[PDB]
Design a protein around this ligand. Structure first.
Ligand SMILES: O=C(NCC1CCN(Cc2cc(CN3CCC(C4CCNCC4)CC3)cc(-c3cc(Cl)cc(Cl)c3)c2)CC1)C(F)(F)F
Ligand SMILES: *[C@@H]1O[C@H](CO)[C@@H](O)[C@H](O)[C@H]1NC(C)=O
Ligand SMILES: [Ca+2]
Ligand SMILES: [Ca+2]
Ligand SMILES: [Ca+2]
Ligand SMILES: [Cl-]
Ligand code: NA
Ligand code: NA
Ligand code: NA
Ligand code: NA
Length: 472
């Protein structure tokens, strides 16, 4: 195997490293996997389809302009180069290799398109038409953005966009399901908590956070229990950043944020799908859970879950490992059909006050076709009133003792609107048996005499009843 000769490939430290602080992509390339036959689309501000490092892999069938309602996603050029981000992301996935230009994509033989959908008013219809673009041609969608990362917003897909997610995972990709890769957010300095973003908090999105070059949680990171895994991105000014294609046929060394991590993940997922094109959308999440690596990622919240995997709210299961992903994909046995066990928990509304604990022992639909002995995602769907939302912290403890933070305190969130059946999601109990006692904790983290009421708690378990591995 001959590694790429591109002039900036040595600067792509998160691929070309020899120090073990990389995504282990060369190992996948050397196994023969470069993304041939896979189609990725970047949902963003457009794609410079004539970029010298993108044209050779550009796919019009992976592209559309939902902002202007035409097929051509070319960015709008401005003095401030506002609409460059999709071009940066596209190159992370699929910049052409061995052509003397900039660097390479993770999946440098994949086909790459973009949906121009952020350069204009983003409505539910715009979102739905983007998520649902050509779902039997596009394999993988990469989205780096969501609701405002101001640390006070709670929002998620409205009806058309949620329908696009369910149509995508159900009928997309020949019934195997569209793979939606999402950035968990850039709201770290606003103390944002990313389960309040319904796109990354979705079970249908494969959500990705960031680590800095030296293995730390970047300033912009959001912690939450819905995150699955991590890729490298930017950090402080002594740490390197992401090197990729830029608007106006240029090359940047300063692409940054969690919004730069999701495209690298999308590229690794492209290599993995080349290794086994029959993987379902859930298979892909299982592969990420099993192969991702905590080592050398620094956080104070690493915890071992009930099947012996280390998990963090900053990093999920750790750093994506492309060589391991493609290796495990090749002989992967398709997971069983997804079961869903719905447990309405409360017999009466519960005053929150300073602190509320709700304990319930469940059988996880014992005796029914939705009996789950092997969890995937779990949700606590909560309806509650409170006078100052951001003073709340919420935790969910599984029968195996795994504490998931569903909501951390958000100091900027002054809302008095509470949560209206908000489906807080955790990945941290993946592969655990969910039978037994679950505990929901709601706490007022402030000294203020805050008040409100929990009126509904639905525990929603997804998963299967077969196929478990021996704990790690
Ligand atoms: O219709 C209703 N709400 C419609 C809302 C529409 C909006 N949306 C949230 C959102 C907003 C935005 C736009 N940005 C631009 C400025 C900054 C913060 C916001 C970008 C995305 C988004 C969606 C997809 Cl798919 C891919 C990608 Cl990359 C980004 C998402 C929440 C729903 C209601 F009436 F029901 F409420
Ligand atoms: C894909 O997986 C399904 C489910 O296990 C199986 O029935 C089918 O034969 C597989 N197809 C290929 C081409 O491997
Ligand atoms: Ca256009
Ligand atoms: Ca190149
Ligand atoms: Ca956020
Ligand atoms: Cl569902
Ligand atoms: Na975001
Ligand atoms: Na997700
Ligand atoms: Na534990
Ligand atoms: Na149990």
């Amino acid at each position: 195997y001959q590694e790429p000769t591109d002039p900036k490939f040595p600067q792509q430290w998160y691929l070309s490293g020899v120090t073990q602080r990389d995504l282990n992509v060369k190992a996948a390339w050397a196994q023969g996997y470069t993304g041939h036959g896979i189609v990725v689309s970047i949902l963003d501000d457009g794609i410079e389809k004539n970029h010298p490092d993108l044209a050779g892999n550009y796919d019009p069938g992976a592209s559309f302009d939902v902002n202007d309602q035409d097929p051509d996603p070319q960015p709008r050029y401005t003095q401030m180069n506002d609409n460059r981000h999709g071009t940066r992301c596209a190159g992370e996935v699929a910049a052409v290799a061995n052509n003397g230009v900039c660097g390479v994509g993770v999946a440098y033989n994949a086909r790459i398109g973009g949906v121009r959908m952020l350069d204009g008013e983003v409505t539910d219809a715009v979102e739905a038409r983007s998520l649902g673009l050509n779902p039997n041609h596009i394999h993988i969608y990469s989205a780096s953005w969501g609701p405002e990362d101001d640390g006070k917003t709670v929002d998620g897909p409205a009806r058309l966009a949620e329908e696009a997610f369910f149509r995508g995972v159900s009928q997309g990709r020949g019934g195997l399901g569209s793979i939606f890769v999402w950035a968990s957010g850039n709201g770290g300095r606003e103390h944002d908590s990313c389960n309040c973003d319904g796109y990354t908090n979705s079970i249908y999105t494969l959500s990705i956070s960031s680590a800095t070059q030296f293995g730390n949680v970047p300033w912009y990171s959001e912690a939450c229990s819905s995150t699955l895994a991590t890729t490298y991105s930017s950090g402080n000014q002594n740490e390197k950043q992401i090197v990729t294609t830029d608007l106006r046929q240029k090359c940047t060394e300063s692409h940054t944020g969690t919004s730069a991590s999701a495209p690298l993940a999308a590229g690794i997922i492209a290599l993995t799908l080349e290794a086994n094109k029959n993987l379902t959308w859930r298979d892909m999440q299982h592969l990420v859970v099993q192969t991702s690596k905590p080592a050398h990622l620094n956080a104070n919240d690493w915890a071992t879950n009930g099947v012996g995997r280390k998990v963090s709210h900053s990093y999920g299961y750790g750093l994506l490992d492309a060589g391991a992903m493609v290796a495990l994909a090749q002989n992967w046995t398709t997971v069983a059909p997804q079961r869903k066990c719905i447990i309405d928990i409360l017999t009466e509304p519960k005053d929150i006050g300073k602190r509320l604990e709700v304990r319930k022992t469940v059988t996880a639909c014992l005796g029914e076709p939705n009996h789950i002995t092997r969890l995937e995602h779990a949700q606590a769907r909560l309806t509650l009133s409170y006078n100052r939302r951001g003073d709340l912290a919420i935790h969910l403890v599984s029968p195996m003792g795994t504490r998931s933070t569903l909501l951390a305190a958000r100091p900027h969130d002054y809302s008095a609107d509470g949560f209206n059946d908000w489906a807080f999601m955790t990945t941290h109990s993946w592969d655990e048996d969910p039978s037994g006692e679950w505990v929901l904790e709601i706490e007022n983290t402030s000294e203020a005499n805050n008040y409100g009421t929990l009126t509904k708690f639905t525990l929603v378990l997804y998963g299967t009843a077969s196929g478990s591995l021996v704990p790690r």
